[PDB]
RNA sequence: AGUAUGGGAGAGGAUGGUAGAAUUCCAGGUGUAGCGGUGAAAUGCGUAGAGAUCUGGAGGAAUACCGAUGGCGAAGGCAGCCAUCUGGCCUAAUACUGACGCUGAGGUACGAAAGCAUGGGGAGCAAACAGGAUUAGAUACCCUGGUAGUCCAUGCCGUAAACGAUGUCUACUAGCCGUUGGGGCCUUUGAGGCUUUAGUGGCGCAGCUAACGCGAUAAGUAGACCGCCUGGGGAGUACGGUC
């Protein structure tokens, strides 16, 4: 991130730009993942569901 | 024999010795038999992150052809030489003799 | 793609240092694996940062 | 591992005719060389189960080829087993 | 007593509590505050407002050292990370930079079990 | 069906080394009242100084991002990077052997997790267990701790919803759209368009089916061999036998 400030940038706008930087980075997502241990079977099922949904979305876009 | 690419990182304090060490390695390789296809000195470069509280080191590149016994000797020398901080050895197919990038 | 070609290697690394996926960069499957291996080798050689 | 020169030598030693690379004698000799070479590897890696399957496959292929040679002509079979040093 | 122009504010936000500390460069501490420290004991600790009051009190305490520009480091999820920086800016400080320093393992230790609630 | 020679992709297996991030613990610098946790609390930790922050060390385990309806493997299963040993697969054209093939009762080898034996190691997690809560009761669900175990070496044990709930091999039977590793042909604006092949996905005609659905990766049309079923319980249980 390292959101350096301009000479006259408002602090609120700076915090808004920092929020965009962090949201693009996706740091909070990994922290959310790390809270609990997920079993390999559950991870497999989740990834399978995600892939199926992505394929259906792409087909819908193509149609 | 086989072709190996070697990259060496040398402590800056021992920079003046680099010419001697590479010469000794080449002498050993040639005495065994050896075929030194490439030798490059990238120069003293800054490290993207510190290693043993060192912020910069000397970078050396070599492309050689030698046998298993030699490879073992060079590996042992690199491990037990305190001037060297990190070495990468890669098996390669065919020999690279062209001028490489980062050689400026 | 070789580990010594940092100018090109950097075009597929984010500011945080993470490797950009193939989806966003449009590269091919075979190219992506070589590029990831080269980035890992460059990280080991302390030529590019692991993180930050 | 064996080299191209070694395989060429075995084929030269066991070839019935020119360009003969498909004869049972040549095939069995090549398999025997490969097996006796792999014995050394399996001496140092006892728990490499995945390679032992290929080794067993080589053994089975040699057995089938030897049986075919025995069924077709006994004299060639006896000569081959004698040359290669195999009990049966 | 000692006067330092430059300082850093660490915001250790969590789902249960927010801790705001002010240190100098090289990490020596000057002042600190917490939601539990300033009333709000209970579930209201995690609310952003308590983060704002903690940041205000921490900044007022740190002003004695005469620092007017401070860097910002933020670590952890949960509310209060934004309110703390907003309060620090409002108090009169100048925020030079804001960065996230939340630690990410590269698949190290096993996390605790999931709660069946 | 098999063999020799040129190329290609791959978390296929075994052994050793090495890098970064993070957690725990231990010492040191600043510093003062809380930290932690829950629906809410409480146990627990803290003025012999916690938490937070910075500096230096010990040790164990696993490899973020790339990552994919992706890849490899007979199955079980395989994830950072490097070296050594090693199995299989795909692909081009030549040159060979000449049915050398498919299946397979007994038998034999492999075989997740848990558990067992001897000797090591032990960060985090965690059966048992201890305390704090909720409750009419709480032997549990929630919270604070925590032993075996999870890890390494050498063996044993032979089990799973070990699942596609679909044995192996062979030939044939409308099409349409993806993706992975290769072969061939044509365009030019340096990457695209057609075919072909071996995998891996989504639809769908005919056909099949109690229906749901399957549909060139068949549960369609045919052939070879094997395993298994005959109402629900009693019961994968008793006796005998082998391990
Ligand atoms: Mg081992
Ligand atoms: Mg908890
Ligand atoms: Mg069979
Ligand atoms: Mg049987
Ligand atoms: Mg517990
Ligand atoms: Mg066993
Ligand atoms: Mg069974
Ligand atoms: Mg079954
Ligand atoms: Mg029984």
UniProtKB/TrEMBL annotation, chain E:
<protein>
    <submittedName>
        <fullName>30S ribosomal protein S11</fullName>
    </submittedName>
</protein>
<keyword id="KW-0689">Ribosomal protein</keyword>
<keyword id="KW-0687">Ribonucleoprotein</keyword>
């Amino acid at each position: 991130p390292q959101v350096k400030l301009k000479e006259g940038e408002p602090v609120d706008v700076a915090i808004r730009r920092f929020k965009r930087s962090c949201e693009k980075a996706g740091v909070l997502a990994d922290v959310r993942k790390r809270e609990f241990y997920e079993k390999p079977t559950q991870e497999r099922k989740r990834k399978k569901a995600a892939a199926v949904k992505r394929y259906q979305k792409k087909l819908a876009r193509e149609s | 024999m086989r072709h190996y690419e070697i990259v060496l990182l040398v402590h800056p304090d021992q920079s003046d010795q680099v010419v001697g060490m590479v010469e000794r390695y080449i002498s050993q390789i040639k005495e065994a038999d050896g075929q030194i296809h490439r030798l490059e000195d990238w120069g003293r470069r800054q490290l993207a992150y510190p290693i043993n509280k060192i912020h910069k080191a000397h970078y050396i590149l070599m492309n050689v052809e030698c046998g298993q016994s030699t490879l073992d000797e060079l590996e042992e020398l690199f491990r037990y030489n305190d001037a060297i901080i990190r070495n990468l050895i890669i098996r390669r197919e065919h020999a690279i003799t062209e001028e490489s990038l980062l050689a400026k | 793609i070789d580990y010594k070609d940092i100018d090109t290697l950097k075009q597929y690394i984010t500011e945080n240092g993470k490797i950009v996926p193939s989806r966003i960069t449009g590269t091919k499957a075979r190219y992506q694996r070589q590029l990831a291996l080269a980035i890992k080798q460059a990280r080991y050689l302390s030529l590019i940062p692991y993180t930050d | 591992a064996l080299t191209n020169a070694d395989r060429a030598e075995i084929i030269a030693k066991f070839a019935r005719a020119e360009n003969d690379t498909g004869s049972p004698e040549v095939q069995v000799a090549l398999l025997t060389a490969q097996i006796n070479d792999l014995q050394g590897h399996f001496k140092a890696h006892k728990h490499d189960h995945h390679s032992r399957r290929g080794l067993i496959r080589m053994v089975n292929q040699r057995r089938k080829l030897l049986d075919y040679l025995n069924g077709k002509d006994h004299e060639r079979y006896t000569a081959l087993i004698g040359a290669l040093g195999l009990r049966r | 007593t000692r006067t330092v122009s430059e300082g850093v504010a660490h915001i250790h936000a969590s789902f249960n509590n927010t801790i705001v500390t002010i240190t100098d460069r090289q990490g020596n501490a000057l002042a600190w505050a917490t939601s539990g420290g300033q009333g709000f004991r209970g579930s209201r600790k995690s609310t952003p407002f308590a983060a704002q009051v903690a940041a205000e009190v921490a900044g007022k305490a740190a002003l004695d050292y005469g620092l007017k520009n401070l860097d910002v480091l933020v670590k952890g999820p949960g509310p209060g990370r934004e309110s703390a920086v907003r309060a620090l800016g409002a108090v009169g400080y100048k925020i030079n930079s804001i960065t996230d320093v939340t630690p990410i393992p590269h698949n190290g230790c096993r996390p605790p079990k999931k709660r069946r609630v």
